[PDB]
Amino acid sequence: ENLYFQSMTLRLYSYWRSSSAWRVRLGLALKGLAYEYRAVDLLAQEQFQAAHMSQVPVLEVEEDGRTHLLVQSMAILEWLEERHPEPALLPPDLWGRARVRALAEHVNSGTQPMQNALVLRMLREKVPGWDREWARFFIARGLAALETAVRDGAGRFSHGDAPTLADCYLVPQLYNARRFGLDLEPYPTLRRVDEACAALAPFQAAHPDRQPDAPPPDRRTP
Amino acid sequence: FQSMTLRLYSYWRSSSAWRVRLGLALKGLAYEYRAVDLLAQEQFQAAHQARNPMSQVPVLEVEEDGRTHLLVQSMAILEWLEERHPEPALLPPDLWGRARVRALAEHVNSGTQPMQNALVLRMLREKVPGWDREWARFFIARGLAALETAVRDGAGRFSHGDAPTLADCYLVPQLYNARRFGLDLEPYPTLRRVDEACAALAPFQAAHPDRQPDAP
Numbered sequence: 231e232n233l234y235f236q237s238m239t240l241r242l243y244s245y246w247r248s249s250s251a252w253r254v255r256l257g258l259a260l261k262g263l264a265y266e267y268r269a270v271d272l273l274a275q276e277q278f279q280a281a282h283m284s285q286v287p288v289l290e291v292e293e294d295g296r297t298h299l300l301v302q303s304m305a306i307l308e309w310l311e312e313r314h315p316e317p318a319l320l321p322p323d324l325w326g327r328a329r330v331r332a333l334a335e336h337v338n339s340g341t342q343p344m345q346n347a348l349v350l351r352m353l354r355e356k357v358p359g360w361d362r363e364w365a366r367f368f369i370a371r372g373l374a375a376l377e378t379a380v381r382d383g384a385g386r387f388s389h390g391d392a393p394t395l396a397d398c399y400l401v402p403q404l405y406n407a408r409r410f411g412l413d414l415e416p417y418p419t420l421r422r423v424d425e426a427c428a429a430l431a432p433f434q435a436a437h438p439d440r441q442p443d444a445p446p447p448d449r450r451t452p
Numbered sequence: 453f454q455s456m457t458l459r460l461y462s463y464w465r466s467s468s469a470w471r472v473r474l475g476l477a478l479k480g481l482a483y484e485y486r487a488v489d490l491l492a493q494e495q496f497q498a499a500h501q502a503r504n505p506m507s508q509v510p511v512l513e514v515e516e517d518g519r520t521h522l523l524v525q526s527m528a529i530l531e532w533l534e535e536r537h538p539e540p541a542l543l544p545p546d547l548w549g550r551a552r553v554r555a556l557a558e559h560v561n562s563g564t565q566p567m568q569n570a571l572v573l574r575m576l577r578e579k580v581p582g583w584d585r586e587w588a589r590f591f592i593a594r595g596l597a598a599l600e601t602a603v604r605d606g607a608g609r610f611s612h613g614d615a616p617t618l619a620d621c622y623l624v625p626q627l628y629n630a631r632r633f634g635l636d637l638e639p640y641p642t643l644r645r646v647d648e649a650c651a652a653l654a655p656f657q658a659a660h661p662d663r664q665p666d667a668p
Protein backbone atom coordinates (compact mmCIF):
# COMPACT_ATOMS: atom_id res chain seq x y z
CA GLU A 231 0.00 0.00 0.00
CA ASN A 232 2.80 2.44 0.92
CA LEU A 233 4.88 1.79 -2.18
CA TYR A 234 4.62 4.52 -4.81
CA PHE A 235 3.08 2.05 -7.33
CA GLN A 236 3.27 3.42 -10.89
CA SER A 237 0.15 1.60 -12.14
CA MET A 238 -2.28 3.69 -10.06
CA THR A 239 -5.36 4.62 -12.12
CA LEU A 240 -7.28 7.79 -11.20
CA ARG A 241 -11.02 8.45 -11.39
CA LEU A 242 -12.41 11.86 -10.48
CA TYR A 243 -16.00 12.25 -9.34
CA SER A 244 -16.74 15.71 -10.72
CA TYR A 245 -19.54 18.10 -11.66
CA TRP A 246 -18.76 20.52 -14.48
CA ARG A 247 -19.18 23.76 -12.46
CA SER A 248 -18.23 22.54 -8.99
CA SER A 249 -15.47 24.93 -7.92
CA SER A 250 -14.18 22.31 -5.48
CA ALA A 251 -13.88 19.68 -8.21
CA TRP A 252 -12.33 22.23 -10.56
CA ARG A 253 -9.46 22.76 -8.08
CA VAL A 254 -8.62 19.06 -8.36
CA ARG A 255 -8.96 19.09 -12.15
CA LEU A 256 -6.37 21.88 -12.14
CA GLY A 257 -3.96 19.89 -9.91
CA LEU A 258 -4.35 16.92 -12.23
CA ALA A 259 -3.89 19.00 -15.40
CA LEU A 260 -0.89 20.91 -14.05
CA LYS A 261 0.84 17.65 -13.09
CA GLY A 262 0.03 16.15 -16.51
CA LEU A 263 -1.89 13.27 -14.95
CA ALA A 264 -4.45 11.32 -16.95
CA TYR A 265 -7.70 10.45 -15.22
CA GLU A 266 -11.19 9.13 -15.87
CA TYR A 267 -14.00 11.66 -15.51
CA ARG A 268 -17.00 10.31 -13.54
CA ALA A 269 -19.85 12.82 -13.83
CA VAL A 270 -22.02 13.47 -10.78
CA ASP A 271 -25.13 15.42 -11.76
CA LEU A 272 -25.57 17.58 -8.67
CA LEU A 273 -28.41 19.57 -10.28
CA ALA A 274 -30.42 16.39 -10.96
CA GLN A 275 -29.89 15.25 -7.38
CA GLU A 276 -30.90 18.67 -5.99
CA GLN A 277 -34.13 18.68 -8.03
CA PHE A 278 -34.87 15.03 -7.14
CA GLN A 279 -34.33 15.63 -3.40
CA ALA A 280 -36.59 18.72 -3.51
CA ALA A 281 -39.40 16.92 -5.38
CA HIS A 282 -39.22 13.67 -3.33
CA MET A 283 -25.85 13.23 -1.07
CA SER A 284 -23.09 12.50 -3.59
CA GLN A 285 -19.67 13.83 -2.51
CA VAL A 286 -17.82 16.03 -5.01
CA PRO A 287 -14.86 15.97 -5.47
CA VAL A 288 -13.80 12.41 -4.75
CA LEU A 289 -10.56 11.09 -6.25
CA GLU A 290 -10.71 7.32 -6.58
CA VAL A 291 -7.24 5.75 -6.74
CA GLU A 292 -7.16 2.13 -7.97
CA GLU A 293 -4.20 -0.24 -7.49
CA ASP A 294 -3.44 -3.94 -6.80
CA GLY A 295 -7.14 -4.84 -6.32
CA ARG A 296 -7.54 -2.02 -3.80
CA THR A 297 -9.45 1.24 -4.09
CA HIS A 298 -8.75 4.37 -2.06
CA LEU A 299 -11.34 7.16 -2.01
CA LEU A 300 -9.75 10.55 -1.33
CA VAL A 301 -12.02 13.41 -0.23
CA GLN A 302 -11.60 17.15 0.46
CA SER A 303 -9.95 19.15 -2.30
CA MET A 304 -7.03 20.29 -0.13
CA ALA A 305 -6.30 16.75 1.10
CA ILE A 306 -6.54 15.46 -2.47
CA LEU A 307 -4.19 18.13 -3.78
CA GLU A 308 -1.68 17.57 -0.93
CA TRP A 309 -1.74 13.86 -1.83
CA LEU A 310 -1.10 14.65 -5.52
CA GLU A 311 1.83 16.85 -4.50
CA GLU A 312 3.37 14.14 -2.27
CA ARG A 313 2.80 11.32 -4.77
CA HIS A 314 3.81 13.27 -7.88
CA PRO A 315 6.27 15.94 -6.72
CA GLU A 316 7.19 17.26 -10.19
CA PRO A 317 6.08 19.76 -11.34
CA ALA A 318 5.76 21.14 -7.80
CA LEU A 319 2.63 23.09 -6.91
CA LEU A 320 4.12 23.92 -3.50
CA PRO A 321 7.58 25.50 -3.33
CA PRO A 322 10.42 23.83 -1.42
CA ASP A 323 10.98 26.66 1.07
CA LEU A 324 8.83 26.51 4.17
CA TRP A 325 7.75 30.17 4.23
CA GLY A 326 6.49 29.93 0.64
CA ARG A 327 4.64 26.71 1.44
CA ALA A 328 2.89 28.42 4.35
CA ARG A 329 1.99 31.40 2.16
CA VAL A 330 0.59 29.26 -0.65
CA ARG A 331 -1.43 27.14 1.79
CA ALA A 332 -2.82 30.31 3.40
CA LEU A 333 -3.96 31.67 0.02
CA ALA A 334 -5.58 28.31 -0.71
CA GLU A 335 -7.29 28.25 2.69
CA HIS A 336 -8.66 31.78 2.28
CA VAL A 337 -10.74 30.22 -0.49
CA ASN A 338 -11.11 26.68 0.85
CA SER A 339 -12.26 27.64 4.33
CA GLY A 340 -12.76 31.41 4.14
CA THR A 341 -14.89 31.97 1.03
CA GLN A 342 -16.34 28.92 -0.71
CA PRO A 343 -18.19 27.43 2.29
CA MET A 344 -20.25 30.63 2.60
CA GLN A 345 -21.53 30.20 -0.95
CA ASN A 346 -21.96 26.46 -1.29
CA ALA A 347 -25.20 25.19 -2.78
CA LEU A 348 -26.70 23.93 0.51
CA VAL A 349 -26.03 27.27 2.22
CA LEU A 350 -27.54 29.25 -0.64
CA ARG A 351 -30.64 27.02 -0.82
CA MET A 352 -31.34 27.44 2.90
CA LEU A 353 -30.91 31.23 2.65
CA ARG A 354 -33.38 31.68 -0.22
CA GLU A 355 -35.89 29.34 1.45
CA LYS A 356 -36.11 31.68 4.46
CA VAL A 357 -35.60 34.99 2.60
CA PRO A 358 -36.24 34.90 -1.20
CA GLY A 359 -33.45 36.41 -3.34
CA TRP A 360 -31.09 37.01 -0.41
CA ASP A 361 -28.80 34.06 -1.25
CA ARG A 362 -27.15 35.92 -4.16
CA GLU A 363 -26.65 39.07 -2.06
CA TRP A 364 -25.09 36.90 0.65
CA ALA A 365 -22.84 35.14 -1.86
CA ARG A 366 -21.62 38.48 -3.24
CA PHE A 367 -20.90 39.78 0.27
CA PHE A 368 -18.87 36.77 1.37
CA ILE A 369 -17.10 36.29 -1.94
CA ALA A 370 -16.11 39.97 -1.99
CA ARG A 371 -14.76 39.64 1.57
CA GLY A 372 -12.65 36.64 0.59
CA LEU A 373 -11.35 38.24 -2.60
CA ALA A 374 -10.41 41.44 -0.71
CA ALA A 375 -8.29 39.34 1.67
CA LEU A 376 -6.72 37.55 -1.30
CA GLU A 377 -6.02 40.72 -3.28
CA THR A 378 -3.97 42.09 -0.36
CA ALA A 379 -2.22 38.79 0.41
CA VAL A 380 -1.56 37.90 -3.26
CA ARG A 381 -0.12 41.31 -4.22
CA ASP A 382 2.63 40.68 -1.65
CA GLY A 383 4.55 37.78 -3.30
CA ALA A 384 2.81 37.40 -6.66
CA GLY A 385 4.87 37.46 -9.84
CA ARG A 386 3.03 36.38 -12.97
CA PHE A 387 0.91 34.09 -10.74
CA SER A 388 -0.40 34.04 -7.13
CA HIS A 389 3.05 32.97 -5.84
CA GLY A 390 6.00 33.81 -8.06
CA ASP A 391 6.21 33.11 -11.78
CA ALA A 392 4.74 29.60 -12.02
CA PRO A 393 1.37 28.10 -11.04
CA THR A 394 0.91 26.76 -7.51
CA LEU A 395 -1.93 25.37 -5.42
CA ALA A 396 -2.95 28.99 -4.73
CA ASP A 397 -3.95 29.47 -8.38
CA CYS A 398 -5.90 26.19 -8.24
CA TYR A 399 -8.12 27.80 -5.57
CA LEU A 400 -8.19 31.35 -6.98
CA VAL A 401 -9.32 30.67 -10.54
CA PRO A 402 -12.52 28.74 -9.72
CA GLN A 403 -13.43 31.26 -7.03
CA LEU A 404 -13.21 34.15 -9.51
CA TYR A 405 -15.52 32.21 -11.85
CA ASN A 406 -18.06 31.94 -9.01
CA ALA A 407 -17.69 35.64 -8.31
CA ARG A 408 -18.72 36.33 -11.92
CA ARG A 409 -21.57 33.81 -11.73
CA PHE A 410 -23.10 35.83 -8.85
CA GLY A 411 -22.53 39.17 -10.62
CA LEU A 412 -19.80 40.47 -8.34
CA ASP A 413 -17.81 43.37 -9.78
CA LEU A 414 -14.12 42.37 -9.91
CA GLU A 415 -12.79 45.92 -10.46
CA PRO A 416 -11.41 46.13 -6.86
CA TYR A 417 -9.15 43.06 -7.36
CA PRO A 418 -6.62 44.10 -10.02
CA THR A 419 -3.87 41.65 -8.99
CA LEU A 420 -6.33 38.74 -8.93
CA ARG A 421 -7.67 39.70 -12.37
CA ARG A 422 -4.11 39.81 -13.74
CA VAL A 423 -3.31 36.38 -12.31
CA ASP A 424 -6.59 35.01 -13.67
CA GLU A 425 -5.63 36.22 -17.16
CA ALA A 426 -2.15 34.63 -16.95
CA CYS A 427 -3.67 31.32 -15.88
CA ALA A 428 -6.41 31.41 -18.54
CA ALA A 429 -3.80 31.39 -21.36
CA LEU A 430 -2.29 28.07 -20.19
CA ALA A 431 -3.47 24.79 -21.71
CA PRO A 432 -3.90 22.98 -18.34
CA PHE A 433 -6.26 25.70 -17.12
CA GLN A 434 -8.21 25.60 -20.37
CA ALA A 435 -8.57 21.81 -20.02
CA ALA A 436 -9.96 22.06 -16.47
CA HIS A 437 -12.53 24.81 -17.12
CA PRO A 438 -16.22 23.93 -16.58
CA ASP A 439 -17.10 24.51 -20.26
CA ARG A 440 -14.69 21.77 -21.41
CA GLN A 441 -15.96 19.05 -19.06
CA PRO A 442 -17.89 16.01 -20.36
CA ASP A 443 -21.08 16.98 -18.46
CA ALA A 444 -21.11 20.68 -19.39
CA PRO A 445 -24.49 21.80 -20.77
CA PRO A 446 -24.63 24.20 -23.68
CA PRO A 447 -24.88 27.89 -22.70
CA ASP A 448 -28.67 27.98 -23.22
CA ARG A 449 -29.29 25.11 -20.74
CA ARG A 450 -27.33 26.46 -17.76
CA THR A 451 -29.11 27.88 -14.75
CA PRO A 452 -27.71 31.12 -13.29
CA PHE B 453 22.16 34.80 13.93
CA GLN B 454 18.71 35.50 15.41
CA SER B 455 17.24 32.10 16.33
CA MET B 456 13.55 31.46 15.65
CA THR B 457 10.98 32.99 18.03
CA LEU B 458 7.21 32.38 18.09
CA ARG B 459 4.35 34.69 19.04
CA LEU B 460 0.69 33.65 18.75
CA TYR B 461 -2.17 36.12 18.38
CA SER B 462 -4.99 34.29 20.10
CA TYR B 463 -8.35 34.62 21.84
CA TRP B 464 -9.07 32.21 24.70
CA ARG B 465 -12.35 30.87 23.27
CA SER B 466 -11.46 30.92 19.55
CA SER B 467 -11.59 27.40 18.12
CA SER B 468 -9.34 28.47 15.24
CA ALA B 469 -6.68 29.72 17.68
CA TRP B 470 -7.09 26.70 19.94
CA ARG B 471 -6.14 24.35 17.05
CA VAL B 472 -2.81 26.14 16.76
CA ARG B 473 -2.30 26.17 20.54
CA LEU B 474 -2.71 22.38 20.38
CA GLY B 475 -0.09 22.00 17.63
CA LEU B 476 2.35 24.15 19.59
CA ALA B 477 1.72 22.31 22.87
CA LEU B 478 1.90 18.85 21.30
CA LYS B 479 5.29 19.75 19.79
CA GLY B 480 6.60 21.19 23.07
CA LEU B 481 7.07 24.64 21.55
CA ALA B 482 7.12 27.76 23.72
CA TYR B 483 5.43 30.86 22.38
CA GLU B 484 4.51 34.36 23.47
CA TYR B 485 0.74 34.65 23.95
CA ARG B 486 -0.67 37.88 22.52
CA ALA B 487 -4.32 38.30 23.46
CA VAL B 488 -6.73 39.86 20.99
CA ASP B 489 -9.92 41.64 22.15
CA LEU B 490 -12.02 39.59 19.78
CA LEU B 491 -15.38 40.72 21.11
CA ALA B 492 -14.55 44.41 20.59
CA GLN B 493 -13.10 43.55 17.19
CA GLU B 494 -16.23 41.65 16.16
CA GLN B 495 -18.49 44.49 17.31
CA PHE B 496 -16.56 46.90 15.09
CA GLN B 497 -16.61 44.46 12.13
CA ALA B 498 -20.38 44.03 12.50
CA ALA B 499 -20.97 47.80 12.34
CA HIS B 500 -18.58 48.24 9.37
CA GLN B 501 -19.35 45.55 6.79
CA ALA B 502 -16.44 43.40 8.07
CA ARG B 503 -13.94 45.63 6.21
CA ASN B 504 -11.04 45.55 8.76
CA PRO B 505 -8.16 43.83 6.90
CA MET B 506 -5.49 41.34 8.05
CA SER B 507 -7.34 40.95 11.36
CA GLN B 508 -8.14 37.20 11.56
CA VAL B 509 -6.98 35.12 14.55
CA PRO B 510 -4.88 32.97 14.75
CA VAL B 511 -1.75 34.64 13.45
CA LEU B 512 1.60 33.03 14.23
CA GLU B 513 4.34 35.64 14.10
CA VAL B 514 7.72 34.01 13.51
CA GLU B 515 11.01 35.93 13.66
CA GLU B 516 14.21 34.35 12.40
CA ASP B 517 17.50 35.80 11.09
CA GLY B 518 16.18 39.37 11.42
CA ARG B 519 13.09 38.72 9.28
CA THR B 520 9.48 38.59 10.48
CA HIS B 521 6.86 36.25 9.02
CA LEU B 522 3.14 36.49 9.74
CA LEU B 523 1.56 33.06 9.24
CA VAL B 524 -2.22 32.95 8.89
CA GLN B 525 -4.86 30.21 8.50
CA SER B 526 -4.81 27.48 11.12
CA MET B 527 -4.24 24.65 8.65
CA ALA B 528 -1.35 26.47 6.91
CA ILE B 529 0.19 27.27 10.30
CA LEU B 530 -0.18 23.66 11.50
CA GLU B 531 1.35 22.28 8.30
CA TRP B 532 4.26 24.72 8.78
CA LEU B 533 4.77 23.54 12.37
CA GLU B 534 4.81 19.93 11.13
CA GLU B 535 7.43 20.73 8.44
CA ARG B 536 9.53 23.05 10.62
CA HIS B 537 9.52 20.96 13.78
CA PRO B 538 8.86 17.35 12.70
CA GLU B 539 9.05 15.58 16.08
CA PRO B 540 6.68 14.66 17.56
CA ALA B 541 4.79 14.10 14.32
CA LEU B 542 1.22 15.28 13.96
CA LEU B 543 0.80 13.66 10.55
CA PRO B 544 1.27 9.95 9.85
CA PRO B 545 4.17 8.76 7.66
CA ASP B 546 2.19 7.14 4.83
CA LEU B 547 0.44 8.93 1.97
CA TRP B 548 -2.98 7.37 2.57
CA GLY B 549 -3.05 8.21 6.29
CA ARG B 550 -1.89 11.75 5.60
CA ALA B 551 -4.75 12.27 3.13
CA ARG B 552 -7.21 10.82 5.68
CA VAL B 553 -5.99 13.04 8.49
CA ARG B 554 -6.06 16.14 6.27
CA ALA B 555 -9.60 15.30 5.16
CA LEU B 556 -10.76 14.96 8.79
CA ALA B 557 -9.14 18.29 9.63
CA GLU B 558 -10.73 19.96 6.58
CA HIS B 559 -14.20 18.60 7.48
CA VAL B 560 -13.95 20.95 10.48
CA ASN B 561 -11.76 23.69 8.97
CA SER B 562 -13.81 24.16 5.80
CA GLY B 563 -16.97 22.09 6.44
CA THR B 564 -18.21 22.93 9.95
CA GLN B 565 -16.56 25.93 11.63
CA PRO B 566 -17.20 28.52 8.91
CA MET B 567 -20.96 27.91 9.28
CA GLN B 568 -20.77 29.15 12.88
CA ASN B 569 -18.36 32.07 12.37
CA ALA B 570 -19.52 35.09 14.37
CA LEU B 571 -19.98 37.18 11.19
CA VAL B 572 -22.06 34.51 9.47
CA LEU B 573 -24.29 34.17 12.54
CA ARG B 574 -24.51 37.97 12.96
CA MET B 575 -25.71 38.42 9.36
CA LEU B 576 -28.30 35.71 9.83
CA ARG B 577 -29.45 37.31 13.12
CA GLU B 578 -29.74 40.79 11.58
CA LYS B 579 -32.12 39.43 8.95
CA VAL B 580 -34.10 37.00 11.12
CA PRO B 581 -33.46 37.06 14.88
CA GLY B 582 -33.06 33.53 16.28
CA TRP B 583 -32.15 32.04 12.87
CA ASP B 584 -28.49 32.06 13.88
CA ARG B 585 -29.07 29.47 16.64
CA GLU B 586 -31.05 27.12 14.38
CA TRP B 587 -28.40 27.46 11.67
CA ALA B 588 -25.38 26.87 13.92
CA ARG B 589 -27.05 23.85 15.49
CA PHE B 590 -28.00 22.42 12.09
CA PHE B 591 -24.56 22.84 10.54
CA ILE B 592 -22.51 21.77 13.56
CA ALA B 593 -24.64 18.63 13.99
CA ARG B 594 -24.41 17.88 10.26
CA GLY B 595 -20.62 18.30 10.37
CA LEU B 596 -20.25 16.14 13.46
CA ALA B 597 -22.49 13.37 12.08
CA ALA B 598 -20.34 13.15 8.94
CA LEU B 599 -17.18 13.40 11.05
CA GLU B 600 -18.31 10.58 13.36
CA THR B 601 -18.68 8.24 10.38
CA ALA B 602 -15.33 9.22 8.89
CA VAL B 603 -13.42 9.05 12.19
CA ARG B 604 -14.91 5.68 13.15
CA ASP B 605 -13.38 4.18 9.99
CA GLY B 606 -9.73 4.41 11.11
CA ALA B 607 -9.72 5.70 14.71
CA GLY B 608 -7.69 3.86 17.31
CA ARG B 609 -7.28 5.59 20.67
CA PHE B 610 -7.33 8.90 18.70
CA SER B 611 -8.95 10.09 15.44
CA HIS B 612 -6.28 8.31 13.41
CA GLY B 613 -4.61 5.32 15.06
CA ASP B 614 -3.04 5.51 18.48
CA ALA B 615 -1.27 8.88 18.52
CA PRO B 616 -2.64 12.43 18.36
CA THR B 617 -2.65 14.01 14.90
CA LEU B 618 -3.81 17.22 13.26
CA ALA B 619 -7.27 15.64 13.08
CA ASP B 620 -7.57 15.73 16.89
CA CYS B 621 -6.43 19.36 16.92
CA TYR B 622 -9.52 20.19 14.84
CA LEU B 623 -11.96 17.80 16.56
CA VAL B 624 -11.51 18.85 20.18
CA PRO B 625 -12.24 22.59 19.75
CA GLN B 626 -15.22 21.86 17.48
CA LEU B 627 -16.82 19.61 20.17
CA TYR B 628 -16.44 22.43 22.70
CA ASN B 629 -18.27 24.71 20.28
CA ALA B 630 -21.03 22.12 19.82
CA ARG B 631 -21.53 22.11 23.61
CA ARG B 632 -21.65 25.93 23.60
CA PHE B 633 -24.63 25.75 21.17
CA GLY B 634 -26.35 23.16 23.39
CA LEU B 635 -25.98 20.20 21.03
CA ASP B 636 -26.40 16.67 22.30
CA LEU B 637 -23.10 14.82 21.69
CA GLU B 638 -24.52 11.36 22.37
CA PRO B 639 -24.85 10.66 18.59
CA TYR B 640 -21.03 10.87 18.14
CA PRO B 641 -19.62 8.17 20.42
CA THR B 642 -16.31 7.78 18.58
CA LEU B 643 -15.74 11.53 18.66
CA ARG B 644 -16.51 11.61 22.37
CA ARG B 645 -14.16 8.70 23.15
CA VAL B 646 -11.37 10.44 21.21
CA ASP B 647 -12.11 13.75 22.94
CA GLU B 648 -11.79 12.00 26.31
CA ALA B 649 -8.47 10.38 25.36
CA CYS B 650 -7.12 13.80 24.29
CA ALA B 651 -8.43 15.55 27.42
CA ALA B 652 -6.21 13.37 29.60
CA LEU B 653 -3.02 14.66 27.91
CA ALA B 654 -1.03 17.58 29.34
CA PRO B 655 -0.74 19.42 26.00
CA PHE B 656 -4.53 19.39 25.53
CA GLN B 657 -5.00 20.61 29.09
CA ALA B 658 -2.52 23.45 28.48
CA ALA B 659 -4.19 24.60 25.23
CA HIS B 660 -7.75 24.65 26.64
CA PRO B 661 -9.56 28.04 26.67
CA ASP B 662 -9.77 28.12 30.49
CA ARG B 663 -5.96 27.97 30.83
CA GLN B 664 -5.25 30.96 28.57
CA PRO B 665 -4.06 34.31 29.93
CA ASP B 666 -7.13 36.13 28.58
CA ALA B 667 -9.69 33.68 30.00
CA PRO B 668 -12.11 35.64 32.25
Ligand SMILES: N[C@@H](CCC(=O)N[C@@H](CS)C(=O)NCC(=O)O)C(=O)O
Pocket residue numbers: 250272284285286287301302303304338346347348349558562563594
Ligand atom coordinates in the same frame (compact mmCIF):
# COMPACT_ATOMS: atom_id res chain seq x y z
N1 LIG C 1 -14.31 21.81 1.33
C1 LIG C 1 -14.81 20.85 0.35
C2 LIG C 1 -16.00 21.47 -0.38
C3 LIG C 1 -16.79 20.47 -1.24
C4 LIG C 1 -18.27 20.82 -1.26
O1 LIG C 1 -18.64 21.99 -1.20
N2 LIG C 1 -19.12 19.80 -1.27
C5 LIG C 1 -20.56 19.98 -1.09
C6 LIG C 1 -21.33 18.72 -1.50
S1 LIG C 1 -21.14 18.24 -3.25
C7 LIG C 1 -20.86 20.27 0.35
O2 LIG C 1 -20.13 19.79 1.22
N3 LIG C 1 -21.92 21.02 0.62
C8 LIG C 1 -22.32 21.32 1.99
C9 LIG C 1 -22.92 20.10 2.65
O3 LIG C 1 -23.49 19.25 1.93
O4 LIG C 1 -22.83 19.98 3.89
C10 LIG C 1 -13.69 20.53 -0.60
O5 LIG C 1 -12.82 21.38 -0.73
O6 LIG C 1 -13.66 19.43 -1.21
Ligand SMILES: N[C@@H](CCC(=O)N[C@@H](CS)C(=O)NCC(=O)O)C(=O)O
Pocket residue numbers: 339340463466467468469490493494497504507508509510524525526527561569
Ligand atom coordinates in the same frame (compact mmCIF):
# COMPACT_ATOMS: atom_id res chain seq x y z
N1 LIG D 1 -10.24 29.29 8.61
C1 LIG D 1 -9.63 30.25 9.54
C2 LIG D 1 -10.71 30.74 10.50
C3 LIG D 1 -10.27 31.92 11.37
C4 LIG D 1 -11.46 32.60 12.03
O1 LIG D 1 -12.60 32.22 11.80
N2 LIG D 1 -11.17 33.64 12.81
C5 LIG D 1 -12.19 34.47 13.45
C6 LIG D 1 -12.52 33.93 14.82
S1 LIG D 1 -11.09 33.91 15.91
C7 LIG D 1 -11.78 35.92 13.59
O2 LIG D 1 -10.61 36.25 13.57
N3 LIG D 1 -12.76 36.80 13.71
C8 LIG D 1 -12.51 38.22 13.81
C9 LIG D 1 -12.51 38.91 12.47
O3 LIG D 1 -12.82 38.25 11.45
O4 LIG D 1 -12.20 40.12 12.45
C10 LIG D 1 -8.51 29.55 10.27
O5 LIG D 1 -8.61 28.31 10.35
O6 LIG D 1 -7.54 30.21 10.72
